[PDB]
Amino acid sequence: MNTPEHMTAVVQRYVAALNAGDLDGIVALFADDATVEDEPRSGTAAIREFYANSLKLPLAVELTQEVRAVANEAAFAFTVSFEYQGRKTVVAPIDHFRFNGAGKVVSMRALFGEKNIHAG
Amino acid sequence: MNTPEHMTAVVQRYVAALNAGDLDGIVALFADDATVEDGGEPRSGTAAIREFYANSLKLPLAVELTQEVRAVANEAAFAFTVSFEYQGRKTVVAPIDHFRFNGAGKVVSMRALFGEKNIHAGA
Ligand SMILES: C[C@]12CCc3c(ccc4cc(O)ccc34)[C@@H]1CCC2=O
Ligand SMILES: C[C@]12CCc3c(ccc4cc(O)ccc34)[C@@H]1CCC2=O
Structure with a gap:
């Protein structure tokens, strides 16, 4: 079982x-067979493309509370903000990571709905 | 599909x-065949869910949502605190819970996620 510290x-x-725009660094956290979701994309290529598309605009990301880590899972509340064509958007999801035995992320799911997307 | 408002x-x-100690009011949110799980197997069906919440309610709880709810598709996740006190000693736990809902708008699963570092001794 993964450690909560890890x-x-x-x-x-x-x-x-995310804050540094380090695409290599994001993908390196995931398992070769990971899925991502927020079409559920799978494998290293699809994952890199998912994050490359997000990172077309510089993202400001902040954990807004302590992480919840138990068993082989972690859930976390955060914000992601971007500014483009004169408008700032702040999205407030909750993300859930599942981890494999080797400590890599095998699934991420970012949960948010319309009421969690704030155009201020 | 469920509405996010619902x-x-x-x-x-x-x-x-939870704050009102309203056991039946909690159980009424769940489908007949729902599961609960917190932090060696899930509790399943009405009697087991009732027993789970009756045991939680042995101490008075102060539960607060600490951020907006995330609701989408047939799911919701939420950050909150649960505060209680036993023999003069206070505990604040900070979990994240996830509900899945059926088509009738009842909860079919609740998972509560928290670890040791999410259990705070002292008020
Ligand atoms: C997908 C994501 C959470 C949601 C999200 C991101 C980036 C831009 C977004 C734009 C939106 O209109 C709605 C959601 C996001 C994040 C980048 C990293 C991450 O976990
Ligand atoms: C299970 C629970 C989340 C976690 C939790 C509750 C109550 C007492 C707790 C005591 C703990 O040491 C750790 C977690 C809980 C809540 C009751 C309602 C709920 O969703």
Whole structure:
């Protein structure tokens, strides 16, 4: 079983690589067979493309509370903000990571609905 | 598909029911065949869910949603605190819960996610 310390550090590395625009660094956290979701995309190529599309605009990302890490899972509340064509948007999801035995993320699901997308 | 408004209302109603010690009001949110799981198997069906919540309600709880609900498709996730005190010693737990809903708008599964670092000794 993964340690909560390890899963928590991975969530912080994920947030860090988003803020730095470090696409390599994001993908390196995932397993070769991981899926991502927010069409559920799978495998390294599809994952890289998912994140490359997100990172067409510079993202400001912040964990807004402590991470919840248990068993082989972590859930975390956060914001992701971007500014383009004179408009700032702040999206407030909750993300859930599942991890494999080797400590890599095998699934991420970002949960948010319309009321969690704020155009201020 | 469920509305996000309905799901969000249900999360709020769940919080309120916990604060009011309203056991039947909590159980009424769930489908007949729902599962609960917290942090060696899920509890399944009405009697087991009732027993799960009756045991939680042995101490007075103060539950607060600490951020907006996330609701989408047939699911909702939410951040909150649960605060209780036993023999003068206070605990604040900070979980994230996830509900799945059936087509009738009842909860078919609740998972509560929290670890040791999410259990805070002291008020
Ligand atoms: C997908 C994502 C969460 C949601 C999200 C992101 C980026 C831009 C978005 C734009 C939206 O209109 C709605 C959601 C997002 C994040 C980038 C990393 C991540 O976890
Ligand atoms: C199970 C629960 C979330 C976690 C939790 C509750 C109550 C007492 C707790 C005590 C703990 O040491 C750890 C977690 C809980 C809530 C009751 C309602 C709910 O969803």
